[PDB]
Design a protein around this nucleic acid. Structure first.
Lengths: 179, 160, 187, 128, 122, 52
RNA sequence: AAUCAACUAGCCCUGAAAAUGGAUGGCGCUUAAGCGAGAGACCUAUACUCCGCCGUUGCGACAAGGUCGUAACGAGUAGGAAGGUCGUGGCGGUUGCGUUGAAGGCUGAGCGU
RNA sequence: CAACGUGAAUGCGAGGUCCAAGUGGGCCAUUUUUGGUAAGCAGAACUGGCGCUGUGGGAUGAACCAAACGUGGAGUUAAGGU
RNA sequence: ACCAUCUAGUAGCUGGUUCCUUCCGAAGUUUCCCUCAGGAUAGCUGGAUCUCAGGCAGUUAUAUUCGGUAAAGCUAAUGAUU
RNA sequence: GUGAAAUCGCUGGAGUGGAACCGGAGACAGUUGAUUACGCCGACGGCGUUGGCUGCUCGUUCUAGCCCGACAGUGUUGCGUCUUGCUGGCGGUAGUGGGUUCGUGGCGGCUAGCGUACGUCGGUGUGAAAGUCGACGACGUUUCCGACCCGUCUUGAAACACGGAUUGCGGAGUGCUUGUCUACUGCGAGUCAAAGGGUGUUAAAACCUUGCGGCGAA
């Protein structure tokens, strides 16, 4: 089944259309924003969704273009809202989730990992209906809202540090508190 | 085990089509059959004489004999690891001309005519070969009055 | 692993005559050399028929030789056969025949030589026509054996004319049931 | 070593003997190899950890097959006249006096081989 | 249309894609073997190509590469002249070999990523 | 001890092992089983055509 | 300064009782060495690539029941063939050894898949 | 008799005859399916296997996953794992 | 009963059936049999080879056909049925 | 006469925790070989082949940010159509300028197996003998990995299925009649000749001999 393999899913814009026939010399052009590991998966998913929405399949259609989309300014932090629909072991549900990221692709990757973590849902059972940037005042999730503070501050309470390239045994005393 | 009568399991195979019973139209008898022609076999239940066996229903055969109201046909039948050319005497009512051979004969006629015309007119010999449909060529698609329509997956709705 | 079939990898063949006849082995040697070096399919055919078994070399008839030489253009050609040339009592006139053969019976040899003909061996043919020029290749009828009459569809099969293996011939020997409609049936 | 008269090295694919299965378990079963024919024989079925079976793939190199550790091939000699066959290819063949040759004849054989410059495998044997 | 159905039938057992210039040239130069009288002969010289494809004006490995890449009139002869390439296992390993490329696996049509795979296999 | 046990399990493999042999090409040349009157007229027609 | 209600589904808990002492394979593991989504690298087949050798098959060279070259290949019960300067006992012939020690017997240096 | 000249893709050499062995208890699996409450039960269809078969993995196992085997070596992997 | 012989009685049944390498390599299915632990028969398999040097294929394409299963229907016939 | 195996006793060596045996790979013990050039071995370089790891550098694709302009908003400093910040699209790109993608690209570094366009060198061996060197190390010991008892019937055997305590010797597809096919030999419209006869004294052999008989020619 389709999997969200890869760190930081890529984002593609895929434009396609049904192949013109005699009865329909000109056909509508459809465009989708897809989040996938590579462009082959992007094209396959585009056809999946377009065949779900309109009476056309990969056989009778063609891909006019497929272009990767890169974050304009990855140097700024944004709040992203994700509207998704997913299948549980029992029924179908709609969810709205929020993340904080510098890239929309990063936010969607976070969404996939979070859905897997909290609901044991795999990528084949998730549909990303919509992703947008929400304003700080328009967020509605406590985990995200708690970081909308200009005076945010906190320590690192119990730091367990791993020795990397040196013997297993030592006489040193390990310290977990750093003030 | 099953019984081994001639018409076992032919309940629908030998039945007439819906609203197609009754008198058999006469083009069936006016059709011309010559030895060497290819014919499709489709039993007509309304005629119980000269009926093909159910194994030959829906098969194509080559005519080897032409009698007063029937034809002898050579039909391939698979028996274990060999194909046997069985000979069957079938009446005209269960027979129909096969278009596959006639299409090929027409293509041969067209090929010969095209070759003759090109040679007589001094043109280079044309290409007379069927070719598999090749992948589509390069082209440009214009968006004027055809702006792309942005699609998104739809939310789940409880359709009670 | 590779997906291939080994059932027909090996092809049974004769790379030398099965016979211990030293002269036959020498002839096979000579014509192996000729076939390999001259590169002539005529030499290849002679080699194969030298190595063949006596079943595939059925006797030829002086009448067949005469018919071959009496054809327009074959008068001065050398008839090459690896089958025994036998005498035909039904042949009345023998033309002038030049024949290269392994063995020619006494009667056939006498008649051929009396009619002004010539008989040479395969070694002599190797010198006369190293590439097989001006030759008429002949052989006896391979399917004209009593055993072959017993080969084919079984005797008790429809439209079968195979000779059965009967102890004797007579009204009491396999002629009653399955051979006439008066007794059960007839195929 | 190298085959005498050449530079090709002698290689042994295997040095142990293909001993018959269960010959170590029963005295009635001699060690001489016999191909197992039993339906359930694990050696025949080639289970891991089982003794190997002789195969043509174990065959020695053609250039070094039958060559003794000193680099020569053995030829058996029964009398003085048998020494002639070793005269020409003496750089690759080594003579060996047959077992049944008596001490009376071995003296002459050894002396003639020394004269002819033909090496012997058991020259200094059966001295009475 | 006469070959794509075969590629759909054999989907679970093959990885295929669209080779590019470097892929074709690497395949030909590093692993090119000819079928000469039923024998697998390495193509170490251009004369080997010429002896079998000279009648079609294909005299060099570059001519062969062009014929393959552009699908010339003698594509069938050019490709049948080549022994099936016997490639090495990729250095880096496979991914699943039991799932389509779009399922995060290996089999099926990888499009132009067959070049990425072949850069490790060849 | 039931011993009927019919099955068609390994039969296509056996059939295909030596290939499925299609009928020959000369089978359409024989004039066997053709109308006797037509055959008689064919004999008469062939017995009379002058060779040259 | 958020609260209330009804639902929903992840993990956990109850529902959850059997007889020799006992089983995520065992030890053990708790920001795991568990559950889900992922990433780098790494390990490992008689598989794949390349290199050597043996043989089979196909083809080929050579004045030879032989040698050599070359490419591909090598699972196997019942069963079928081929080769055996593998082994045993006679006969017609041929080659030799032997009371200075044959056959037989015990057992080191080698040869052959 | 005259002329015309090979008319989809891909792969590949093709055909013929004779003589004869063993076998004629099968079993398993995805999918479909009949009897039965069910069964490691009984009976069928297509295909692949085990039987006849080792090898890496599933702690162990005829059938599961990977992959089929001359005899050695170097490198890389499959399924599986660290 | 015992003794010798016919008698090495017959057995579709049980047990055994003795050297090595190489190559190829199955079947438990059809039909008939007082047939069901067995045979004959076809199939599967080996060997000998022979005739030749492009027509074939457990694959596609094109063209043309066959079918009444899944789904669908019962506000279409038959049969139920609120 | 010879005097095997099973089984058994002694002497010496070595192992010895609820089996023992066995395959692969070493080590030890032990056995055995050893004529400047040449053998038997090693090391370091070169070359060929198959590699493994690891860097720079150009370019290609798709794309920015920085920077400028207006507009909208606000997790905002300092003292409110304020200001400083910060964000968002939109319009610019001159300059600066990173990501992504890969090239029938260019230049490197470390290193492995196999073979020998081949070099530079060492150990040993040319009477013995000792030592040294080399190879084995085989039914001894010890380690690491693997390792269930064979034959058989069976869908399925290590089986809580049957036979097998051990060793020697013996032990089972034969003879003949009749068919058929195949291979080889002789002759060939023929071929083989029977019983018999004649002769043969290294005389049961060999040699010669058929109006007639067998099979074949309808």
């Amino acid at each position: 089944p389709t999997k969200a393999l890869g760190e930081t899913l890529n984002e593609y814009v895929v434009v396609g259309r049904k192949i013109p026939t005699e009865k329909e010399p000109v056909t509508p052009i459809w465009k989708m924003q897809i989040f996938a590991t590579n462009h082959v998966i992007a094209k396959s998913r585009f056809w999946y969704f377009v065949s779900m929405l309109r009476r056309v399949k990969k056989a009778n259609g063609e891909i006019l273009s497929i272009k990767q989309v890169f974050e304009k300014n990855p140097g700024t932090v944004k709040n992203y809202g994700v509207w998704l629909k997913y299948d549980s072991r029992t029924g179908h549900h709609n969810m709205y989730r929020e993340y904080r990221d510098t890239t929309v692709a990063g936010a969607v990757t976070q969404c996939y990992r979070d859905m897997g973590a909290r609901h044991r849902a795999q990528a084949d059972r998730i549909h990303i209906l919509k992703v947008q940037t929400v304003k700080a005042e328009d967020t509605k999730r406590a985990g995200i809202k708690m970081f909308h503070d200009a005076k945010i501050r906190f320590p690192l309470p119990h730091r367990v540090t791993k020795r990397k390239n040196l013997s297993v045994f030592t006489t040193a005393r390990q310290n977990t508190h750093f003030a | 085990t099953n019984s081994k009568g001639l018409r076992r399991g032919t309940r629908y195979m030998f039945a007439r089509d819906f609203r197609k019973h009754g008198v058999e139209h006469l083009s069936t008898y006016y059709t011309q059959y010559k030895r060497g022609d290819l014919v499709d076999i489709k039993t007509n239940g309304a005629f119980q004489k000269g009926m093909p066996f159910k194994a030959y229903h829906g098969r194509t055969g080559r005519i080897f004999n032409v009698t007063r109201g029937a034809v002898g046909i050579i039909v391939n039948k698979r028996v274990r690891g060999n194909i046997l050319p069985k000979r069957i005497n079938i009446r005209i009512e269960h027979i129909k001309p096969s278009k596959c051979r006639t299409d090929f004969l027409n293509r041969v006629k067209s090929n010969d005519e095209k070759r003759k015309a090109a040679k007589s007119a001094g043109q280079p010999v044309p290409a007379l070969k069927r070719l598999p449909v090749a992948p589509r060529g390069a082209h440009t698609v214009t968006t004027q009055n055809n702006e792309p329509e942005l699609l998104a997956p739809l939310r789940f709705e409880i359709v009670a | 692993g590779i997906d291939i079939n080994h059932k027909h990898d090996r092809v049974a063949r004769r790379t030398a005559p099965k016979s211990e006849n030293p002269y036959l082995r020498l002839l096979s040697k000579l014509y192996a050399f000729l076939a390999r070096r001259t590169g002539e399919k005529f030499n290849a055919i002679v080699l194969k028929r030298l190595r063949m078994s006596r079943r595939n070399r059925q006797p030829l008839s002086l009448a067949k030789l005469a018919r071959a030489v009496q054809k327009a253009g074959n008068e001065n050609k050398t008839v090459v056969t690896l089958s025994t040339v036998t005498d035909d009592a039904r042949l009345y006139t023998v033309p002038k025949i030049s024949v290269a053969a392994l063995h020619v019976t006494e009667g056939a040899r006498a008649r051929i030589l009396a009619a002004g003909g010539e008989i040479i061996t395969l070694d002599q043919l190797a010198l006369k026509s190293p590439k097989g020029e001006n030759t008429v290749f002949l052989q006896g009828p391979r399917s004209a054996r009593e055993a072959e009459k017993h080969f084919g569809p079984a005797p008790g099969v429809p439209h079968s004319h195979t000779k059965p293996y009967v102890r004797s011939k007579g009204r009491k020997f396999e002629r009653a049931r399955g051979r006439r409609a008066s007794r059960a049936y007839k195929n | 070593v190298h085959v005498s008269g050449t530079k090709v090295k002698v290689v042994k694919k295997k040095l142990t003997k293909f001993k018959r299965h269960e010959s170590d378990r029963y005295r009635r079963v001699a060690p001489s190899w016999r191909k197992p024919k039993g339906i359930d024989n694990r050696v025949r079925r080639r289970f891991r950890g089982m003794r190997a079976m002789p195969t043509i793939g174990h065959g020695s190199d053609r250039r070094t097959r039958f060559v003794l550790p000193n680099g020569y091939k053995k030829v058996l000699v029964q009398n003085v006249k048998d020494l002639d066959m070793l005269l020409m290819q003496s750089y690759k063949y080594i003579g060996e006096i047959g077992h049944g040759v008596s001490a009376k004849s071995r003296k002459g054989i050894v002396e003639r081989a020394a004269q002819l410059n033909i090496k012997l495998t058991n020259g200094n044997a059966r001295l009475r | 249309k006469a070959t794509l159905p075969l590629l759909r039938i054999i989907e679970p057992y093959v990885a295929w894609g669209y080779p590019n210039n470097k892929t074709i040239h690497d395949l030909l130069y590093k692993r090119g073997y000819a079928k000469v009288d039923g024998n697998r002969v390495p193509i170490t010289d251009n004369t080997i190509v010429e002896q079998s494809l000279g009648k079609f004006n294909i005299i060099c490995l570059e001519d062969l590469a062009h014929e393959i890449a552009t699908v010339g009139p003698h594509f069938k002869e050019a490709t049948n002249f080549l022994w099936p390439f016997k490639l090495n296992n990729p250095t880096g390993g496979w991914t699943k070999k039991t799932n389509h490329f779009v399922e995060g696996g290996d089999f099926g049509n990888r499009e132009d990523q067959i070049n990425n795979l072949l850069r490790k296999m060849v | 001890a039931k011993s009927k046990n019919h099955t068609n399990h390994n039969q296509n493999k056996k059939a295909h092992r030596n290939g499925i042999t299609k009928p020959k090409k000369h089978i359409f040349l024989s004039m066997k089983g053709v109308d006797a009157k037509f055959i008689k007229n064919l004999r008469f027609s062939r017995k009379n055509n002058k060779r040259q």
